[PDB]
């Protein structure tokens, strides 16, 4: 019965691509604004570590 | 000659502002997306590393 | 008479994969969107409750 | 300095609503497709009881 799989099945690769793109749309999209904020120099060293910091919660990548 | 100043004066408060909005705004775009893939248990901790060089590499963030 | 089949006949192999289909894709919106907010910390213990309680009382489910 | 608040103030009451919209747009979508399962007879009780644990975990909701 592929009634039950449809509820029951992880993700596709279909599913898997598209949350992926997303995290994609949103690396390209954090580069052009960091990249402006960059050639206007308008980012301290500690404001990008704040930045980075922000990321890697976002994570949950514990270094 | 205030003309001159348009041209020439550094960013104002206001533009400023509007530059590192746009930083938080990708900064939260990306925490959405992030948040959903580490839901469906989607990131390994090479591509979490994988993102967050390429974060620092955006910044300019030698560490 | 296949063209009263047509009207009378139960939910075919088809149909029946598409409504599911529909239902799997809203679960996934919304783990999308509860991903992000349990992320950025926005769900209380009661607030999942009652997410938990809309979902059930869609489903008819009385537990 | 207003710049830095930009990146490391948490969360506005906009940026929290809109979170919050999302995961409520997902509701009634799952419900509007629930809804017509149920009305078609499409769900069986483990198939409701598979959908709100999926949820509840979703939710990060122990119970």
Redesign the interface.
């Known amino acids: 019965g ?3 799989s ?3 099945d992880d ?1 596709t690769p279909q ?2 691509e598209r ?2 793109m ?2 994609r ?3 390209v ?10 050639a ?1 120099r ?2 301290t ?1 500690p ?6 910091a ?3 919660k ?4 514990d ?1």
Not at 29 to 38: E, F
Not at 47 to 52: D, R
Not at 58 to 61: A, H, P, T
């Open positions: 592929p009634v039950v449809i509820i029951r993700l599913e898997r949350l992926m997303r995290v749309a949103a690396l999209d954090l580069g052009v604004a960091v990249g402006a904020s960059v206007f308008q980012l060293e404001m990008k570590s704040e930045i980075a922000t990321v890697k976002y994570l949950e990548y270094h």
